[PDB]
């Protein structure tokens, strides 16, 4: 219905100590494995113009760093928190994925937090090797991946091509290739809604780990020039089926070169689109724009709102209108003195499982746990709404580096003077 | 468990002052909206105004705005509720009823009582 | 007395089923649909029965339900007991200076 903007995820893929042995350490075979159903992945993502970029493997090899259980939530919830403070912090990237051979309970699959695209604590997933072929597999990488985008499990009637599509869920005889009418406008809700930054920008070539293929839209280090399958390229500077240059050309695809010629050097390439996102210029002798960069954590941003964080400016009051309605707003400062009791939704930390020792806050850090928002629209009770499931606790949650106070904010649950 | 525990009962002529305390326990005092409710002996139920326990703001009933002052004692958790010039109709049980998670406009747990009356 | 109306008595019997009535204007009940029902037994505080007209909080036996009907709001009570022998008032949200108004009580004998 619509060409939706290029869009790159930066993916990183985790095998489990469980996994790495079904194969007796035989590491060439996982990765031969883990890249063809990545291609399988960005083949089947083509019509949505998103593409899945590996950008690095993880072996949990001879080891193991978080507690995997039969029980899909409890893991999950382990390896988000594991992912958030050591992957974020040693690795950029968007998304992450852990591939365990270890069946989960109710003969579950696949399982990760929906709308978590850009969220550090919340963009995570999943996976169960149950497939002999790469083919199956992909099926549920891509259902789990859509549901990180916001797309749900087919609603009836939204069927596609009188064949159950990929957000079916449940297993099909013929694996399908396709998603359903109901899952583009949807994307496009999650686009216009959550407006998930982190993927706009490309990786840069160097940084691909993956294996170089011709006609996937990617630019990796081996290849001078990629536009795609042969049928679909319009760039008149390259041809798929040669892959390489046209005779007097001199770039592919890139930002910073234009008109089929290097731009000259100094010349903007990446606008800025934020307040705290810095603008770069081009280096002069590369197709490809520097790395992106924003300003230092810790300026204003929004009309003195908020503080910036790593490139983007949370407030609470843009989560509360996420979370509820457009209409929201944060709740009075009574109610998030609730979080002292350390009841069942009301806590900063808490133990991973359905049962936990949920640790009450610090009466300074009552504003960094749990999210209360004003909403008078679904019903007029409860004062101070907030959200929380045992499925996708972290949601409800203030995300870090917004302000809990002037001069201060919500770092590692804890409100923290700010350019200590 | 959530307890309210409130004062001893009071003999107060008309025309006094009458002031009653209720200590909250086993939850974050500030958190919750504390509501009262005074009863007649025989008759139905009355409602007063709420006090918030952590920014001091209160509403009135219109029957009891020139009436009732609401204080409240966040380093002890306590509420205080004062009613001057008190008239003959004033004899009633008092219970100061809380608030809870799921609902705003309904009360789970009551004190158990004082018991003010006025007479000659 | 308070603004809600109730039958003054009601009476049952353990091996029966009783209804009680409880209603009030557009702005007391009929609107905003966000009536309580308690119960005090004598000399006790009293305890939450339903909310929400017929939501339940938990701890309390099933024998208790509610529903809503134009401005009449109404609770049920099936298989009488030694417990059903007190008082039952009945509250509700008023757009007004007055947040929440009670009702005039009813006394049920089993």
């Known amino acids: 219905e619509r060409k939706f903007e290029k869009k790159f995820i930066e993916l990183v893929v985790v095998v489990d100590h469980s996994m790495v042995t079904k194969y007796n350490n035989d590491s060439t075979a996982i990765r031969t494995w883990i890249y063809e159903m990545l291609n399988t992945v960005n083949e089947i993502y083509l019509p949505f113009n998103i593409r899945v970029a590996l950008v690095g493997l993880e072996f949990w090899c001879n080891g193991d760093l978080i507690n995997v259980t039969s029980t899909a939530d409890d893991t999950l919830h382990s390896f988000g928190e594991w992912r958030a403070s050591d992957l974020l912090n040693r690795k950029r990237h968007d998304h992450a994925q852990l591939l365990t051979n270890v069946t989960l309970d109710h003969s579950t699959l696949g399982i990760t937090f929906v709308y978590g695209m850009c969220k550090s604590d919340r963009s995570v997933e999943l996976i169960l090797d149950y497939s002999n072929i790469t083919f199956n597999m992909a099926y549920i990488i891509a259902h789990e991946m859509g549901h990180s985008l916001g797309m749900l499990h087919d609603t009836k009637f939204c069927t596609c091509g009188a064949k159950p599509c990929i957000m079916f869920g449940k297993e099909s005889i013929p694996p399908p290739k396709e998603f359903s009418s109901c899952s583009y406008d949807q994307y496009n809700k999650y686009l216009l809604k959550y407006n998930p930054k982190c993927i706009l920008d490309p990786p840069l070539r160097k940084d691909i780990a993956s294996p170089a293929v011709c006609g996937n839209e990617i630019w990796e280090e081996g290849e001078e020039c990629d536009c795609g399958s042969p049928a679909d390229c319009r760039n008149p500077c390259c041809d798929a089926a040669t892959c390489k240059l046209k005779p007097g050309a001199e770039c592919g695809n890139g930002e910073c070169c234009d008109k089929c010629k290097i731009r000259k050097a100094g010349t903007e390439c990446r606008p800025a689109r934020d307040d705290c996102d810095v603008a770069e210029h081009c280096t002069g002798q590369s197709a490809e724009c520097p790395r992106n960069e924003f300003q230092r954590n810790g300026q204003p941003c929004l009309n003195n709102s908020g503080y910036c964080y790593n490139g983007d400016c949370p407030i609470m009051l843009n989560q509360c209108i996420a979370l509820f309605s457009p209409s929201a707003t944060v709740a009075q400062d009574s109610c998030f003195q609730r979080n002292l009791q350390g009841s069942y939704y009301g806590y900063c930390t808490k133990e991973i499982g359905y049962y936990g020792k949920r640790f009450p806050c610090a009466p300074q850090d009552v504003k960094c746990g749990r999210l209360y928002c004003l909403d008078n629209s679904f019903k007029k009770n409860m004062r101070c709404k907030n959200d929380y499931s045992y499925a996708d606790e972290n949601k409800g949650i203030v995300e870090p580096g917004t302000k809990c106070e002037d001069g201060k904010v919500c770092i590692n649950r804890k409100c923290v003077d700010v350019n200590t | 468990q959530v307890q309210l525990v409130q004062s001893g009962a009071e003999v107060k002529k008309p025309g006094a002052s009458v002031k009653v305390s209720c200590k909250a326990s086993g939850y974050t005092f500030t958190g919750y909206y504390m509501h009262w409710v005074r009863q007649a002996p025989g008759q139905g139920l009355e409602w007063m105004g709420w006090?918030?326990?952590?920014?001091?703001?209160?509403n009135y009933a219109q029957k009891f705005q020139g009436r009732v002052t609401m204080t409240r004692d966040t380093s002890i958790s306590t509420a205080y509720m004062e009613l001057s010039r008190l008239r003959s109709d004033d004899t009633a049980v008092y219970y100061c009823?809380?608030?809870?998670?799921?609902?705003?406009?309904?009360?789970?747990?009551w004190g158990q009582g004082t018991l003010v009356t006025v007479s000659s | 007395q308070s603004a809600l109306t109730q039958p003054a008595s009601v009476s049952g019997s353990p091996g029966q089923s009783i209804t009680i009535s409880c209603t009030g204007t557009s702005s007391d009940v009929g609107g905003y649909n966000y009536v309580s029902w308690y119960q005090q037994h004598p000399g006790k505080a009293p305890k939450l029965m339903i909310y929400?007209?017929?939501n339940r909080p938990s701890g309390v036996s099933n024998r208790f339900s509610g529903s809503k009907s134009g401005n009449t709001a109404s609770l049920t009570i099936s298989g009488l007991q030694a417990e059903d022998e007190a008082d039952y008032y009945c509250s509700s949200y008023t757009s007004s200076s007055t947040l929440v108004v009670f009702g005039g009580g009813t006394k049920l004998t089993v």
């Open positions: 006090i918030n326990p952590n920014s001091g703001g209160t």
């Open positions: 009823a809380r608030e809870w998670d799921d609902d705003d406009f309904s009360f789970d747990y």
């Open positions: 929400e007209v017929s």
